[PDB]
Design an enzyme around this catalytic site. Structure first.
Site, PDB file in Angstrom:
ATOM      1  N   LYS A 185       0.833  -3.069  -0.382  1.00  0.00           N
ATOM      2  CA  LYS A 185       1.569  -4.160   0.253  1.00  0.00           C
ATOM      3  C   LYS A 185       1.957  -3.836   1.693  1.00  0.00           C
ATOM      4  O   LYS A 185       2.100  -4.744   2.511  1.00  0.00           O
ATOM      5  CB  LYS A 185       2.831  -4.515  -0.556  1.00  0.00           C
ATOM      6  CG  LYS A 185       3.896  -3.413  -0.613  1.00  0.00           C
ATOM      7  CD  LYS A 185       5.300  -3.974  -0.898  1.00  0.00           C
ATOM      8  CE  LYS A 185       6.218  -2.914  -1.502  1.00  0.00           C
ATOM      9  NZ  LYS A 185       7.490  -2.657  -0.736  1.00  0.00           N
ATOM     10  N   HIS A 233      13.531   3.102  -6.791  1.00  0.00           N
ATOM     11  CA  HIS A 233      13.188   2.898  -5.392  1.00  0.00           C
ATOM     12  C   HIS A 233      14.441   2.913  -4.519  1.00  0.00           C
ATOM     13  O   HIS A 233      15.267   2.015  -4.597  1.00  0.00           O
ATOM     14  CB  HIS A 233      12.439   1.586  -5.195  1.00  0.00           C
ATOM     15  CG  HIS A 233      11.884   1.428  -3.819  1.00  0.00           C
ATOM     16  ND1 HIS A 233      10.712   2.030  -3.423  1.00  0.00           N
ATOM     17  CD2 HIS A 233      12.347   0.760  -2.738  1.00  0.00           C
ATOM     18  CE1 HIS A 233      10.477   1.743  -2.156  1.00  0.00           C
ATOM     19  NE2 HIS A 233      11.449   0.967  -1.718  1.00  0.00           N
ATOM     20  N   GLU A 279       5.567   6.334  -4.518  1.00  0.00           N
ATOM     21  CA  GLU A 279       5.014   5.064  -4.080  1.00  0.00           C
ATOM     22  C   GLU A 279       5.212   4.854  -2.576  1.00  0.00           C
ATOM     23  O   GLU A 279       5.774   3.839  -2.175  1.00  0.00           O
ATOM     24  CB  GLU A 279       5.706   3.919  -4.826  1.00  0.00           C
ATOM     25  CG  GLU A 279       5.554   3.931  -6.343  1.00  0.00           C
ATOM     26  CD  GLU A 279       6.403   2.869  -7.034  1.00  0.00           C
ATOM     27  OE1 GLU A 279       6.159   2.584  -8.229  1.00  0.00           O
ATOM     28  OE2 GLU A 279       7.320   2.313  -6.395  1.00  0.00           O
TER      29      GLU A 279
HETATM   30  C1  PXP Z   1       8.520  -1.913  -0.821  1.00  0.00           C
HETATM   31  O1  PXP Z   1       9.905  -1.787  -0.450  1.00  0.00           O
HETATM   32  C2  PXP Z   1       8.212  -0.938  -1.948  1.00  0.00           C
HETATM   33  C3  PXP Z   1       7.596   0.292  -1.736  1.00  0.00           C
HETATM   34  C4  PXP Z   1       7.179   0.810  -0.368  1.00  0.00           C
HETATM   35  O2  PXP Z   1       8.319   1.176   0.391  1.00  0.00           O
HETATM   36  P1  PXP Z   1       8.081   2.019   1.723  1.00  0.00           P
HETATM   37  O3  PXP Z   1       7.054   1.203   2.628  1.00  0.00           O
HETATM   38  O4  PXP Z   1       9.433   2.036   2.540  1.00  0.00           O
HETATM   39  O5  PXP Z   1       7.592   3.390   1.431  1.00  0.00           O
HETATM   40  C5  PXP Z   1       7.354   1.130  -2.812  1.00  0.00           C
HETATM   41  N1  PXP Z   1       7.681   0.808  -4.041  1.00  0.00           N
HETATM   42  C6  PXP Z   1       8.267  -0.366  -4.289  1.00  0.00           C
HETATM   43  C7  PXP Z   1       8.622  -0.720  -5.717  1.00  0.00           C
HETATM   44  C8  PXP Z   1       8.541  -1.251  -3.251  1.00  0.00           C
HETATM   45  O6  PXP Z   1       9.135  -2.441  -3.490  1.00  0.00           O
END
Ligand code: PXP
Ligand code: PXP
Lengths: 347, 368
Positions: free
Chosen positions: A33, A151, A228
């Site tokens: 994403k 997260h 992640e």
């Molecule tokens: C998005 O907030 C998100 C991420 C990626 O976050 P970063 O770009 O700050 O590393 C990872 N895991 C989840 C569940 C998210 O929602």
């Protein structure tokens, strides 16, 4: 004189080398994403990362480039039923959830899924105090709960948030084992900085994570520690070049560029982002700097990138550069006013 | 892609038998135009396509006889592509990329706007026979009235064909008096142009007219103040054409969004959290960009004396910022059921992205 990105893929390679050094126990599953560009996703795949997908479309994108389903985690806690059916037929078994209603869908649609309870560190996260009841109900639904995720987010001033999250995860881990679940995955999420101008460095965040890991999740061949990261990998990789298409004077100046808050700079609204315009021309010594605003090409008066940043007098036809523009930039753009998103070139 | 049914709320219930979708009442657009010809008979609407550039919306408006305000090359190609001539197009972006001006020139579009001298230097090198309209301030755009003399002097030296004045009040007006002051200011600049030798014959009063029922400052009151100001400062004259740039006026109440509840979560005070398959990265980007406040409305029949609970509605996305409604009183819903959002035609389908790989909703059309 259209705008364009320069993505140095070698910056991604260096980020991963630093990840292995700082977090050797943690296998990264890249949050697509953040930046779903092919050369980004191919470089990461080749470096050996997993992938965190949040929809049927992101699963399709990574599976299309030859990534196997076991290197994919479907980390969206609230999934449309059709989207769960699609993941099941792609061989993607690992999915998150944060409530019992999600397990009712999964028991109807993908009963053999390996489910990872996401806990809160308000949209997502089961409160620790609701977790016992959630796991009890999971047993009644015959769910194979195999781990815990959390997260922290990007807005961490104190790295202590990671430590408490990992301690809370151990409490939920032990609950799961007490109820007869095969608990073997800890997923520590994202929020790791991807830029050199971050206050909380990656290196100290990792030190706090590793000390918490040695305490609460001591090494063991059964345990797999996973993360992640999104912005960590791609943020400093992209640089945006934008052309000054207009100019106005009042001392102060007003520059209009051909990319704004509807395009690449949607990060300003959606991602709390602050940017720094940098003249692409060699800076002459002792040239005076005036307080200046920069604006996107749309009608909208909300389409402003910078309020008053001290820049040298510029001209129409010249370029401004924005470093650290690879995270949540090429993914949230739209075709508002009919303006096009910048083309990506690679080093 | 058309749909059966008398009105909008009937046509929704028919189709339901689970991607999100719009239902666009094109006849709502017709009733908005009728109301316009009646309340502002001297003003020719040039629709601001940036608001809703949907194919059927543009075709409906062209057939009603509106012009079109375009802000870019892509929007000009889109209206010219559906059989609209270059005279019925105004290029109302005051700060235009050189290459985009070159494109308007080669397409027959001569009327453009500007608010400063630098813009005229561009137009002289690239489109020297453009009919230019000085946009005046009502901090992003608009030449201050005190600078307008100096600007039109420089325009004389650049041999620009300045032919009018425009302004834009915007949708955030609580008092219609901004329009009356803008029109007086427009007259002042009109007289300066005529004094300096220019052929001033176009007045462009911009947009900002409400397109919803729940707007506090009513259309009829705004139009009332405008017409009094026009009769005062711009009396009827065959050489003068008065023009406006309404966007949300035409299309705001024409679209209704239908969204599916894809998940729920309960908290035993008893509250519910609903996750639907559209959010702030899709159709509800209007919340962040357009200061929009939306009301969720169950499509299912409301059973008498049924309990209401405080509820949040969140998008499908994976961001804590993707929240459509923080707190609204809705009956207990279930996964699979539908929520409806009325008044969703303005700055919704145009600001969408495919963040998280979620697709924007399909549009279906009812023709009252
Ligand atoms: C998005 O907030 C998100 C991420 C990626 O976050 P970063 O770009 O700050 O590393 C990872 N895991 C989840 C569940 C998210 O929602
Ligand atoms: C956009 O704000 C805009 C319009 C359309 O405004 P409404 O949708 O509120 O009617 C008209 N003219 C200009 C110059 C705009 O920028």
């Amino acid at each position: 004189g259209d705008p364009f990105f320069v993505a140095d893929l070698g910056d991604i390679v260096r980020k991963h080398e630093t990840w292995k050094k700082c977090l050797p126990r943690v296998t990264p599953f890249y949050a697509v994403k953040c930046n779903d560009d092919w050369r980004v996703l191919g470089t990461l795949a080749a470096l050996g990362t997993g992938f965190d997908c949040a929809s049927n479309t992101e699963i399709q994108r990574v599976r299309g480039i030859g990534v196997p389903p076991e290197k994919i985690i479907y980390a969206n806690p609230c999934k449309q039923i059709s989207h769960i059916r699609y993941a099941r037929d792609s061989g993607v078994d690992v999915m998150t959830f944060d409530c019992v209603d999600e397990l009712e869908k999964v028991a109807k649609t993908h009963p053999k899924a390996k489910m990872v309870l996401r806990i809160s560190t308000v949209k997502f996260g089961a409160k620790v105090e609701d977790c016992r009841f959630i796991l009890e109900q999971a047993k009644k639904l015959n769910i194979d709960v195999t781990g815990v995720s959390f997260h922290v987010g990007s807005g961490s001033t104190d790295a202590s948030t990671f430590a408490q999250a990992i301690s809370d995860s151990r409490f939920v881990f032990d609950m799961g084992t007490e109820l007869g679940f095969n608990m073997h995955i800890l997923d520590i999420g994202g929020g790791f900085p991807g830029t050199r101008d971050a206050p909380l460095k990656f290196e100290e965040i990792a030190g706090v994570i590793n000390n918490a890991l040695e305490k609460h999740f001591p090494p063991d061949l059964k345990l797999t520690i996973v993360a992640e990261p999104g912005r960590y990998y791609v943020a400093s990789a992209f640089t945006l070049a934008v052309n000054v298409i207009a100019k106005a004077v009042t001392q102060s100046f007003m520059y209009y560029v051909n990319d704004g808050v509807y395009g690449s700079f949607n990060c300003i609204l959606y991602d709390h982002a602050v940017v720094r315009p940098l003249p692409q021309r060699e800076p002459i010594p002792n040239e005076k700097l005036y307080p200046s605003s920069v604006w996107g090409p749309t009608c909208d008066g909300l389409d402003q990138i910078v309020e008053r940043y001290y820049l040298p007098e510029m001209q129409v036809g010249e370029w401004l550069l924005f470093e650290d523009m690879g995270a949540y930039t090429v993914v949230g753009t739209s075709s508002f006013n009919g303006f096009q998103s910048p083309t990506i070139y690679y080093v």
